Write a protein that binds this DNA or RNA. Structure first.
Lengths: 53, 43, 53, 44
DNA sequence: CTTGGCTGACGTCAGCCAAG
DNA sequence: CTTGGCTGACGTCAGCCAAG
């Protein structure tokens, strides 16, 4: 019973660390994308002010 | 819901929100020229 | 040295995990901020769209 | 590995730095937005 | 009211790499 | 050439909680 419980959790721990790794990489990727969109919207809004001023 | 427990649910939420913004962001940027032409119409 | 090495390593492991936890919360926080910033810039750009036809 | 450090402390400090920059510029474009809406009155 | 499935946190081993 | 400081990845223990 012990050997079974250990093997199941040991195998279920690897998939847990994998999902966390992917989740962190997801946040980093989403930060980079939102950063670029932020820079573009700022640059254009600043240009849209110049367009009418 | 807003703060899931499973990592799979967290990833799904982040990709959902990212898709919505990108869809909305690519709409604002889509027709900027239409607004840029309005100025030439006003000047 | 092993009894000292293990103690130093397991103590430098807690702080390592603590910094990662702080780093992830940092990414999540930065994501939320970039979310509100971008959404604000989008609406403001749409405001100048309606205002200037 | 310059923009992508190894130490988490360096990573956190980097994200803090960028966040400060992004917020600083954002608090500028949205600040004097009122002066732009006043220029609109001249047209109509 | 239990359970099984995930996750948080732990300690240990192994490897990278600037600092010696 | 070492070493010490950090981190990746492993397995184990304990606890939370929607699913029963």
């Amino acid at each position: 019973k012990r050997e079974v419980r250990l093997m199941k959790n040991r195998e279920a721990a690897r998939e847990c660390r994998r999902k966390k790794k992917e989740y962190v990489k997801c946040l980093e990727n989403r930060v980079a994308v939102l950063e670029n969109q932020n820079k573009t919207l700022i640059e254009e809004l600043k240009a849209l002010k110049d367009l009418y001023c | 819901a807003s703060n899931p427990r499973k990592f799979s649910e967290k990833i799904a939420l982040q990709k959902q929100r990212q898709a919505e913004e990108t869809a909305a962001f690519e709409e604002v940027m889509m027709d900027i020229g239409s607004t840029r032409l309005q100025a030439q119409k006003l000047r």
